[PDB]
Amino acid sequence: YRYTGKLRPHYPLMPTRPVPSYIQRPDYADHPLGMSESEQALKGTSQIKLLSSEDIEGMRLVCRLAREVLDVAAGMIKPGVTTEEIDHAVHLACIARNCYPSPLNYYNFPKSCCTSVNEVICHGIPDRRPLQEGDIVNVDITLYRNGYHGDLNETFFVGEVDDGARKLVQTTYECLMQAIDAVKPGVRYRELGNIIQKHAQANGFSVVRSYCGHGIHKLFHTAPNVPHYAKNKAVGVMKSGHVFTIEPMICEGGWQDETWPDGWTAVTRDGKRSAQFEHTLLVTDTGCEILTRRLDSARPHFMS
Numbered sequence: 282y283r284y285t286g287k288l289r290p291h292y293p294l295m296p297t298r299p300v301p302s303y304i305q306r307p308d309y310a311d312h313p314l315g316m317s318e319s320e321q322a323l324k325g326t327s328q329i330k331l332l333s334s335e336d337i338e339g340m341r342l343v344c345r346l347a348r349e350v351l352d353v354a355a356g357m358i359k360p361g362v363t364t365e366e367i368d369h370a371v372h373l374a375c376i377a378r379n380c381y382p383s384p385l386n387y388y389n390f391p392k393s394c395c396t397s398v399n400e401v402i403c404h405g406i407p408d409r410r411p412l413q414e415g416d417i418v419n420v421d422i423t424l425y426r427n428g429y430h431g432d433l434n435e436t437f438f439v440g441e442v443d444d445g446a447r448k449l450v451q452t453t454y455e456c457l458m459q460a461i462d463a464v465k466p467g468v469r470y471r472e473l474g475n476i477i478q479k480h481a482q483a484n485g486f487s488v489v490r491s492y493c494g495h496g497i498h499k500l501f502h503t504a505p506n507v508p509h510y511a512k513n514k515a516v517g518v519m520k521s522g523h524v525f526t527i528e529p530m531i532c533e534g535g536w537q538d539e540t541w542p543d544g545w546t547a548v549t550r551d552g553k554r555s556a557q558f559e560h561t562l563l564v565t566d567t568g569c570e571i572l573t574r575r576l577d578s579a580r581p582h583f584m585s
């Protein structure tokens with residue numbers, strides 16, 4: 282395999298971390314290939330669930346807990362810390378909150394969260410590589426509690442970073458917030474991509490096309506599929522009660538992506554950097570509720 286940039290996987294990975302049996306597990310948790318029958322039982326369907334009061338309270342809770350766990354990871358970002366150390370803390374934080382770390386064994390994903398450094402677009406596997414000064418790293422968190430999944434992610438700076446990194450991360454967050462600002466009943470899901478690409482393109486960046494936002498609730502990934510690029514064929518119209526994510530991945534160079542031999546790590550084909558931000562949203566009558574919002578601060582960690 283010909284790597285696209287300077288990053289390389291750092292094996293071996295510590296033995297799989299166990300989750301106490303008292304924590305409720307999703308269906309794929311114990312599947313040999315990590316397959317989700319409940320999810321596949323809807324694969325291909327474009328119909329979108331309309332959550333009930335019970336579902337909404339369930340989503341508000343797991344999403345709040347997921348934010349708490351991302352904040353734990355955020356406090357560990359610094360030169361010298363390995364992504365595996367971050368994952369360990371995330372794993373323990375999920376357990377402490379009586380939640381199962383959704384990524385664990387999801388289609389056999391080996392860890393409890395995704396850590397994506399520099400050219401890694403998404404799904405980076407926490408490993409033995411120490412974070413280096415100047416790196417940017419995204420931590421994507423998803424928790425499962427009482428049958429519901431809560432999903433969010435942020436890109437962080439490791440020590441001081443160059444202007445290019447600052448601009449990429451800042452623009453990516455702005456893309457996310459502009460998209461969220463347009464969410465309300467009646468808006469087509471395909472519209473978000475137009476908003477995102479417009480801003481990314483205006484700043485000299487490209488939008489990843491292989492991965493999209495997604496519905497989430499009793500399932501980790503389900504309808505609707507939400508592309509982040511312009512003129513897409515996304516199917517569906519927003520309605521009060523819908524819950525989904527917007528998680529744009531923006532790149533310094535081209536948008537082309539490819540996967541590492543591990544079957545998960547997605548990287549830019551040109552080896553340039555990529556950043557991402559994500560929130561789980563609940564469409565309301567007046568717009569939308571950002572279920573994964575930070576509660577003790579009006580801004581994401583990178584502007585600190």
Ligand SMILES: CC(C)(C)C(=O)Nc1cccnc1C(=O)Nc1nccs1
Pocket residue numbers: 383384385387388390394395404492493495502
């Ligand atoms: C079923 C699947 C793994 C092929 C899939 O559609 N998957 C998907 C789509 C869009 C975004 N994200 C994912 C995903 O898995 N994300 C993960 N995060 C942590 C472990 S697996």
Ligand SMILES: [Co+2]
Pocket residue numbers: 403404
């Ligand atoms: Co994912």
Ligand SMILES: [Co+2]
Pocket residue numbers: 421422423432433434528559
């Ligand atoms: Co996510």
Ligand SMILES: [Co+2]
Pocket residue numbers: 432433494495526528559
């Ligand atoms: Co997501």
Ligand SMILES: [K+]
Pocket residue numbers: 397398399400401402403417418419554555556557
């Ligand atoms: K990255």
